[PDB]
């Protein structure tokens, strides 16, 4: 069947058209990577850096985020849906049952994440998420209980379009598989369309996905050389698409997102441009060059030959060594380099930005300027909780119920609420408000033996203002 | 000066404990702990990656390799395809142990009201364990 | 031919040493536990 | 309905009697430009300082070719009076601007 | 069998869409050469001194 | 290699230069071609 709608003119035709509003966003990602780790986004189309500052900054930033978003700990917490929890009121035997199994799905999602090597790609995703504006995650259907890994598309080899409300309209990936690796269905179709191919020729394999105006859902298909692929057609429901395109810094009214390193790029280039001249200056400084005056008695041959302890025909007025003596201007340049390198170290959550060799750093400032690294990190964490953590869980839940690896549970737990953050670690505000209320009942211990004081009404209003449940206290 | 400036930057990236070694100032004790928790932060990075890339595949292969040469005395069906935990879980100092004696220590918080006038310690000793996230099955 | 510095040498060696003692100690460093589907089967 | 419009226009700094609000950074903009204009000249100055340029006197015996070629440890035909390096020495005025 | 091959190829730094992985030292290679290129001239200078 | 009894079954390690790999889209292994460089006087009598 010829398909129309969004994919009316094929797949590769949409890729190349949308490659035009994406080209600025990959040039930006190109510059930021050139000054950090070039391998994350090479400057191939539209060599290592002189400094390792951005390098250690980028890696430390991702590490701190990956260990924050995706620990070995359980980092999501499913809890009973509100509408179907009011139904089960005062029923703790049939209610603990619903939360216990919810905490079984809490674990199943983890085991799937562990054994399928999701973490190692999520790291390379966060690294990409920061230097480039966007990443594309694909997690295929569970397909049994095998090794189902996660696929990652960097911005340059994929393309996206969004609407006014920011919903996904269509996505066209672009693998670059070598002919000798394609499935035999696609392989014979290729050389059978004209031109036989070698074992190392590279074949561009596109993958359109698009909404259908009539249906409320997505249609996909693979595509090679201009003709559709055998057995590649399929549909995904709108609410559970296994292709997730993640942005870093939103700009409502745009297909792609802005990168994190982009905002401090101007200083990051200033540092590399400086470190170049500084190191180059240091090489000239440590370069020993003599200067024998030819009108003099000392001959250069005799000196290079001489051993230690040798006396040699010559006067000291004839020889001199090439002094660079730019000690002054170096201290100027090195001071600027360290000043910039410090400003960035705050923006890369480096714990060694407190490291000011200027003063006897106290113990009371270390705590306070460390709570500015915690303040600017909670920023990106509570953002990526919405942009990458919650969508990732939401997809695996519906993906694992659809391949019935989730042992069925009473209706109340089919659409619950997905809590993340300090809630799921177990050290959240709930636990806080409880033993902050217990500690307000030990305050009325010097009147537990109360003369007409009435401890019953007070022990209740304390829990009211704090905000516990008070159900059965 | 340039060599030492770089050599310090590298010493951080090789998890060298002697990157704290700045001959510049009277190095305090409160920065040593903090700049050491930047070496642990970037090491926990590579560890949780290699746990997936090299630790788990090595165990998963040896498990199926040793069940196939019957050096594994057979076990009831439930344990032939299990889940393989690594990391601080397997050392024995994991989050589970943390959440339990983090919950025991919240039941000593209501010791100045163990003799409770109508306070009802039974429902509270249960909700405390609820928010933390233990099993509560038979407590 | 050898390098003029031993910085990377001791750095690389310290990197491997710390990782091997983290990943592969004399301790037991894996923990097998009952599969979830067959653990709900053996409840109570 | 008037009481529940789902289009919300938010101001930062009110100025009762005006459609729009004032930005927060606006109030400190003058210093914010003073810093950028300064950092420009400051950063640019460090680049000139770290730029190594020789100055071989053509009336002298030392020829520039021989120096660029020379290895470390090599002796070279020349006198130290012929070569000099382009000193910036604005250390004083730098500390002022910084 | 596909699920248990006793030949295991390990990557260090993934780049999804490539047979091999990137090294860890690669990312900081520029400074590592800056130091060695310097240490040579420094050590060589100390011998001349 | 396979446990092959309860003997001394060590582990073999191939550095990148003497082995080669190819993968698919999802990152699964397609083929591997190693490359030992054993000296003739060491090969098994069958191969020799």
Residue numbers in the entry:
A (entry chain C): 3 to 48, 55 to 481
B (entry chain D): 343 to 481
C (entry chain D): 55 to 98
D (entry chain B): 245 to 342
E (entry chain D): 245 to 293
F (entry chain D): 148 to 195
Sentences from the study reporting this entry:
Its overall architecture corresponds to a ring-like hollow cylindrical dodecamer. However, portals have also been described to be able to assemble as undecameric or tridecameric complexes after overexpression, although they are only incorporated into the procapsids as dodecamers. The portal protein of the T7 bacteriophage is coded by the gp8 gene and has a predicted molecular weight of 59 kDa, which would give a multimeric complex of 650–770 kDa, depending on its oligomerization state.
Nevertheless, self-rotation function (SRF) calculations performed with MOLREP indicated that the T7 portal was composed of 13 protomers in the data set 1 crystal. Comparing the peaks at χ = 30°, χ = 27.7° and χ = 25.7°, which would correspond to the presence of dodecameric, tridecameric or tetradecameric NCS, respectively, the highest peak was found to be in the χ = 27.7° section. Therefore, the complex present in the crystal was a tri­decamer, with one ring per asymmetric unit and with a solvent content of 49%. Eventually, the 3D classification of a subset of 1200 particles with RELION yielded a map of a tridecameric portal at 7.8 Å resolution. The model was then subjected to rigid-body refinement by protomer using REFMAC5, which moved all of the protomers significantly (3.5 Å) towards the central channel, shrinking the particle diameter and central channel.
